[PDB]
Every structure is written in C-alpha cells, then in structure tokens.
Write a protein that binds this ligand. Structure first.
Ligand SMILES: Fc1cccc(N2CCC[C@@H](Nc3cc(N4CCOCC4)ncn3)C2)c1
Lengths: 294, 298
C-alpha cells in the first residue's frame, strides 16, 4: 500500500531535474540532488524549497546524511571532486574524496567514510579526512561495473567488488564468485547474509542460501527496521517504471508498484512512514513524488 | 572500546542472584537466570524487571533462547531434572526435561534438536517428542575433559564431544583430536572449516594443526553472531575469573584483554553484536553473592 501524497518540483524551472533523494536525519527536510549538482532542501510539511546549495559541477548520484544530523556525503557523475563530506550544523565542505565515485558512512559508529574508485575501496577518517586503508586484491577482483564498497553493520567487515574483507587485518576473507557484470552487493542489515544481485550468501560459511530472480540488476534499500527490502531494476534514468518490495526475512515479494514513470532514485524516512521516489514526468522532467507507507 | 551503558541488579532482592544471561529475540530485553532457579526478563537499558518464572529448585547455570522466540533451554546445578526445554509462545510451560544433562544447547542450522552433556557423554534429543535419539560415547577415543560441552557444527552434520568428531547420520566417531589440556573440550568455528580446542586450531578437512594460540588457554570461547570476534573468559561460585579476552576470528590475533576486577558469571552479545552483557559479582572471590548485569556498547 503506497498512497501518493504530494509532489516536490524545482521552482523557477520549465523542467524539473531531480536525480537523487534522502530524508534529513530528523526528517523535517527532504534533500534532493539535481542534474546540475545542486542540493535542494524541501520542508516535508510545507512542501517549500528552503535552500539550494552548489555541491558539484555534475549530476548528484548519491546522498547520505549522518544519523546525528551534523554531516552529509554527496557523490556526482563527472569532473572533480566526485564525492565530498559537508557540515550540516552553516553548510560548508569538510573534506573532498576527489577520485571516489561513491561514498558511504560506517554503520555502527559513523567515524569513517568508505569510498569506491572502480575496483578499489578507500577508508577515510571523518575528522582528519586522511586515508586509513586501501582495500584491493588483484587476485580476487570481479571488476563489477557498478561496484560500491560498503561496511557491514558492525564495521568489522567490508564488501568490495564481491570480495569480503576483514577491516582490522586489512586481508581478504573470501571472494564471492561472479554471476552478473554490474551489481557488487550489500550486507543484509541482519548481519548474517550477503546479497549480491540474485544470490543470497551465508556470511559465515559462504554457502549459497537463496536465489532471488526478481533482484536481478536491482538497487536494494532496506527500511530502518530491516524487515522490508525495496528493489528498483537498472535500465539517462538509472531504473525503470516499477519497484518491488520483499520480506527481508524470507526474500518473498510483498508488492510490485508500477508508478508508470521511469524511477531515478527512492529512499525511506527513519520512521518508515514515507517513500520519496524521483519519477520522470516527461518522455528530463524528474519530479519527487511523496507516498504514504501503509 | 567497550563503553559501559547500564548496570542493574535483581530488583528488590537483599542479595542479587543473577548467574547467567542471554538476549531475547526481542531487541532491548535480556533473559537472566538466578541462583534460586528463576528466569527473569529485564529491560537491559532501564534495568527494570518485566517478568519472572520459576524454572528450577537450584541455581540456573546456562540458558539459550531459540532464534524464533518460541523455545528456551535451561540448566541448573543439582535439580532433577538438571536441564529442561520451555515453551514461550502463550503460557510459559515445560515441554521436555533432560534429567541427567548438566548442559544443553540447540542444533545450529535448524533448531529441531537439543544436544546435552553428562560428563564425557553426549545425548541428542528431538524437540517435538523429547525422545533421546543418540548417546555418543566411544570408550577408545575419550579425552575425559573436566569441562566437556558437546556441540553441533554449523550444518548439524557433525558433533564435537570430549574432543571427538562424530558423524551424526552414522553416529560413528570419525576423528579423535589429541589432548593438550585437562578442562576445555572446544567449539566449531562458525566458518565450518576449523575446530578450536583450547589453544589448538584444527583444520576440519585434513585434521592438521593450523595454529597454537596460547592466550586461549582455559577459556570458554564464544563467537559474536556475525562470527568476526571470539570472546574468551578464563576458568579460575563462578567457574570464571575477573578477565575476558577478545580475538579476531579471521586471524586469531588478540584484540582486547578486559579485567573487571570482579568474578564474571556469564557474558553474551545481542543478535546485532552492538552490545555485550556481563554478569559480575560485587571483591575478587567474594563469599557474598550480590551480582550485577553490566551492559557495554561494543
Ligand atoms: F569452562 C567451561 C567450558 C565450557 C562451558 C562452561 N560453562 C557452560 C555454561 C555454564 C558455566 N557454569 C556456570 C556455573 C554457575 N554457577 C551458578 C552458581 O552456582 C554455581 C554454578 N554460573 C554460571 N555458569 C560453565 C565452562
């Protein structure tokens, strides 16, 4: 049950150019990246645009606010810096990650950033911005075209290019075998499973647990309690006109939602009451439609 | 860093009698056994008691909730029965007893069986019927470990009992690991490839010695749920002293040595491995039993 509420659109523009969405830490703001590298803040209540910040010189591809509301990670498409860390408590650049096309925070304590440059993962200290670790084992590389390195929920492990790393020893534990060209995978928020495209792997024994065909070429996001998984399939619009929900315990579908328009991105708020979806109104005119979750 | 978050005692008792603990399937709720045979449910953050159940007429030594929240194993000191299986669905009720076993745990992959230990002997039981399916003891291969604790491997194909590897389907001993200590019988690595018997790390394929880790000596070793950290409390009334040790599960390198300067009765982690609960007595080798639960954020 996804009940459309409202639309956020770019004020003072013929066509809308939203490319990515994230709710602010305490959800008073929807943060919308644009195709020209602006970060626009919208009040969820009033629907009004409160600020437009010049973050990058190309389309924003990724946004992640820190849980404490003090920091924001951004990634763009081309040029430099590809990724940056911003203070949210005046809006200022804290550090740049010049060559990393994707960045995420550590999960348990958000003291670190993990960046991806092709097949290579970099870990940075938030305070200093210094590079602490480079994770790349050329013996084990899968060369995934959409590789995105990520920490597990405890920050002890990293998944990079389908390879599981022990962060403390900076050594590869296991290479998961390649069965697609693009998707490198994520940790299940439950901490026990690795989800790589259609393959569900046991984190501890590395045995295959499940095949989930409906996840093929999907971006996967979880609700904040990790009971529901969202998948939007990659096809310019990154995804198509539908997303799918899955029970995160058994990987069985809950709903296929056809919005009848190409999806650029989707995110949930911390309380799992809202779904924001970037939808192409044109045939870009990419608006952000808000849905009640339920 | 282990950051103390909360401390609490057994509510309203002159002397606090917590002896063991395990996190519930419910996020912020810890189950605790007591020296008078009660099972307590506490809010681990507020320290407030929620529920109490009468399980045994002697001290609870160990408890293990099932992953699905439906079942609980308990073991007591000198009660009859020594161990029992409880339903927690609607009414809290005893399903089955394991008369002679001083320790019990669930099978690992599918929790459809219980494995109990009586000295050097392992018993395997069906959860549905309570029926004893197997008695595992080989008089030729016994190591006679004083703190023997029989266990299934991650896939439930194998059992380690008194340092002997058993094929469960055939109920035959397939290998005896040579004895290097008097007490510690060992556990499976959650990766399913290694057996950890006191200071010895054995390869499950070749049965070759992979590593010797002196810092593990006389430790009850447990893994966090993710299998990234090994926690060891050393034997020295509590069986344990005032220290617990952590090791990297991938390379067995020590991480931390934590001396709480009080005897430890038990320790456990939450399903998300964010927290460590420790039961500690309030001087060293205190005759007085007055324990607290301390919660650390990891
Ligand atoms: F050295 C080992 C090796 C393997 C397992 C253990 N454990 C298994 C769980 C139970 C442990 N024993 C106790 C005993 C105990 N007390 C309660 C008070 O009366 C004395 C026994 N309190 C807590 N734990 C021993 C010890």
């Amino acid at each position: 049950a996804f009940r459309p509420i409202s639309v956020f659109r770019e004020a003072n523009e013929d066509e809308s150019g939203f490319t990515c969405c994230a709710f602010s830490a305490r959800e008073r703001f929807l943060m919308l990246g644009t195709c020209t590298g602006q970060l626009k803040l919208y009040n969820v209540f009033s629907g009004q645009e409160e600020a437009s910040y010049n973050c990058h010189n190309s389309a924003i591809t990724h946004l992640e606010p820190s849980r404490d509301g003090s920091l924001l990670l951004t990634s763009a498409t081309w040029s430099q810096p590809l990724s940056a860390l911003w203070g949210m408590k005046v809006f200022d650049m804290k550090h740049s990650f010049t060559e990393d096309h994707y960045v995420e925070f550590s999960k348990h304590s958000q003291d670190r950033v993990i960046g991806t440059k092709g097949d290579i993962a970099h870990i940075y200290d938030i305070q200093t911005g210094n590079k602490l670790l480079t994770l790349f084992n050329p013996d084990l590389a899968n060369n995934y075209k959409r590789n995105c390195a990520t920490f597990n929920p405890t920050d002890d492990l990293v998944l990079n290019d389908g390879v599981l790393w022990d962060v403390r020893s900076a050594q590869a534990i296991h290479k998961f075998d390649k069965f697609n060209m693009n998707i490198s995978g994520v940790f299940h928020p439950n901490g026990l499973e690795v989800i790589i495209n259609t393959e569900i792997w046991d984190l501890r024994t590395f045995h295959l647990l499940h095949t989930v065909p409906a996840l093929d070429q999907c971006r996967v996001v979880f609700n904040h309690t990790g009971t529901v998984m969202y998948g939007a399939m990659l096809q310019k619009s990154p995804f198509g006109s539908s997303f799918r929900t899955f029970n995160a315990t058994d990987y069985k579908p809950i709903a296929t939602i056809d919005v009848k328009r190409n999806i650029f991105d989707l995110c949930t708020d911390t309380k799992d009451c809202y779904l924001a979806v970037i939808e192409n109104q044109g045939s870009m005119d990419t608006v952000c439609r808000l849905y009640e979750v339920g």
